[PDB]
Amino acid sequence: GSSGSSGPISERNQDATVYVGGLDEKVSEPLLWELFLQAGPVVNTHMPKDRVTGQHQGYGFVEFLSEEDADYAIKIMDMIKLYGKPIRVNKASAHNKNLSGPSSG
């Protein structure tokens, strides 16, 4: 399998990490991990926490082994209703799309 074709590294990456905004109170980091395994090999997850109630701040992150696995997770998990509440998904190096156009010249 392709995961064996190169050695591991400690370094974190914002293109191999996806951002997920609009999370429900029932969402957790272990949920995001196991849910995003459908796109590709998940390595790590992050959900920032509130300083008074300790709950998540309504957004999270999922990190893949490679950028091509993250770019596909953004294709299959965006505008979807996790627990009946719509999530927005993109690269953790970006926020939202600024330009658009046709599929060919």
Reconstruct the topology from this structure:
Layout: E1 17-21, H1 29-36, E2 42-46, E3 59-64, H2 67-77, E4 81-82, E5 85-86, E6 88-91
Antiparallel strand pairs: 1-3, 1-6, 2-3, 4-5
Rg over alpha carbons? 15 Å
Question: Count the strands?
Answer: 6
Q: Main beta sheet, described?
A: 4 strands, antiparallel
Backbone shape: globular
- At the fourth CATH level, what is the homologous superfamily? RRM (RNA recognition motif) domain
| Helix/strand class | alpha+beta
Counted up, domains total: 1
Question: What is the assembly state of the chains in this entry?
Answer: monomer
How far is it from the N-terminal to the C-terminal residue, by CA? Answer: 37 Å
Largest sheet strand order: 2-3-1-6
Total DSSP helices = 2
Question: Can you describe what's shown?
Answer:
The protein has 105 residues and is of the alpha+beta class. The chain has one domain (14-93): Alpha-Beta Plaits, CATH 3.30.70. The protein contains two helices and six strands; from the N terminus they run βαββαβββ. The chain has helices at 29-36, 67-77, and strands at residues 17-21, 42-46, 59-64, 81-82, 85-86, 88-91. The strands form two sheets. The chain has a four-stranded antiparallel sheet, with helices on one face. A two-stranded antiparallel ribbon has the order 4-5. The longest helix is centred in the last third of the chain and has 11 residues, at 67-77. It is classed as rna binding protein. The entry lists the keywords RRM, SF3b145, U2 snRNP, Structural Genomics. The assembly is monomeric. The entry is titled "Solution structure of the first RRM domain of human spliceosomal protein SF3b49".
